[PDB]
Amino acid sequence: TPRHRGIFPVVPTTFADTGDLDLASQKRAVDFMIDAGSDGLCILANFSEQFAITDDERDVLTRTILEHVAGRVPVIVTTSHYSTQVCAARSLRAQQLGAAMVMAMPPYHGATFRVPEAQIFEFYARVSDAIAIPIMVQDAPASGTALSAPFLARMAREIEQVAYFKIETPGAANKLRELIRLGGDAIEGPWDGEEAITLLADLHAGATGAMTGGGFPDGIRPILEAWREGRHDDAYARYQAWLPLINHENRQSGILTAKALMREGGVIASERPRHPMPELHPDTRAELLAIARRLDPLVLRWAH
């Protein structure tokens, strides 16, 4: 019954080699990910290097990418901010610009500044009140913020637009199972993240969507489709084939993985981060390409 399910990869932010936004490459990345079979796209998330860009740049990218997707697949726009009012305003604008959904971390800042549960609940209520499209709660280590399954489920039951979840804290499968149990019908989207590293456990737990890196959603989507067709052994085989690539993303090359692949495939002009994020080490990048070449992903043969 959910409005959304399947694979929702994170669109990377493309820069020129000198760090300015490279919107021409940005559009190509988007077109490639659509062609790779993505069910939807998530933009301006932490895999998109959003911590490295300014508010003005976020807005340029949100308009640029939504216009370019052109209604082809639903887009989740990341709108996280400590201020409830700022987040609410970003989420309304994203809606007005054509987002299907927004995603927000709970409000926090840095390693030190956190917000009591009661006020986190208010933050999401007020953002929900401002908008008419669903909210995805991002449950990730970078917030340093504990969001228990009961609390998450209580938000989904009591707050109209809270309906989707990116569960990326350790033991996601266990937590997904509990969220689903406690939240019932209100949990529209029990999804995972972490570049699909725990995808097969999370599907057994009831995950119905996955937010992966943007480099090879074509390789991962069939795992979700096999699971959806009731073919758990076939899902195992597909996961086994691609797991070394998912694992190298998750443990070695990280955020830049999708960009190294796209730059190798000629999809984007530069795979660099903005300074000071470090470049991929040479052996790490060489290893990454070597693994990808064993798997023949679309990004290395995208004839556009």
Name the one range near its own copies by CB under 8 A: 34-42, 76-84, 179-187, 258-266. Answer: 76-84
Judge whether 87 and 113 are in contact, CB under 8 Å: no
As measured in angstroms, the least distance from the Cβ of 53 to its own copies is 7
Residue 116 in the binding site for its own copies (CB under 8 A): yes
Q: Which of 1, 96, 170, 276 binds its own copies (CB under 8 A)?
A: 276
CA distance 90 to 130: 10
Contact letters for its own copies, residues 139-168 (x by CB under 8 A):
-xxxxx------------------------
CA-closest candidate to residue 78, choices 66, 62, 60: 62
Backbone angles phi, psi at 232, to 5 degrees: -65, -35
Burial classification of residue 219, based on how many CB atoms lie within 10 Å of its CB (0-12 exposed, 13-18 middle, 19 or more buried): buried
Backbone angles phi, psi at 137, to 5 degrees: -85, 120
Active site residue 175: no
- Catalytic entry in 27, 166, 175, 259: 166
As measured in angstroms, the least distance from the Cβ of 54 to Na ion is 22
Judge whether 229 and 266 are in contact, CB under 8 Å: no
Residue 171 in the binding site for its own copies (CB under 8 A): no
**How far from the centroid of its chain's Cα atoms is residue 99's Cα?**
14
Give, as ranges, the residues between 161 and 180 that touch Na ion (CB under 5 A).
168
As measured in angstroms, the least distance from the Cβ of 80 to its own copies is 10
**Cβ closer to Na ion: 161 or 198?**
198
185 binds, among its own copies, Na ion, none (CB under 5 to 8 A by kind): none
Q: Which of 278, 283, 301, 304 binds its own copies (CB under 8 A)?
A: 278
Residue 170, C-beta contacts closer than 8 angstroms, at least 6 positions apart? 141
Residue 53 in the binding site for its own copies (CB under 8 A): yes
Burial pattern 104-117, b for ≥16 Cβ within 10 A else e, equals: bbbbbeeeeebbee
- Helix, strand, coil share (%) of the chain residues, nearest 5: 50, 10, 35
Residue 109 in the binding site for its own copies (CB under 8 A): yes
Q: Could you list the active site residues? A: 166
Residues in contact with its own copies by CB under 8 A are 19, 46, 51-56, 81-86, 107-113, 115-116, 119-120, 122-123, 126, 140-144, 274-278
Residues in contact with Na ion by CB under 5 A are 168, 193
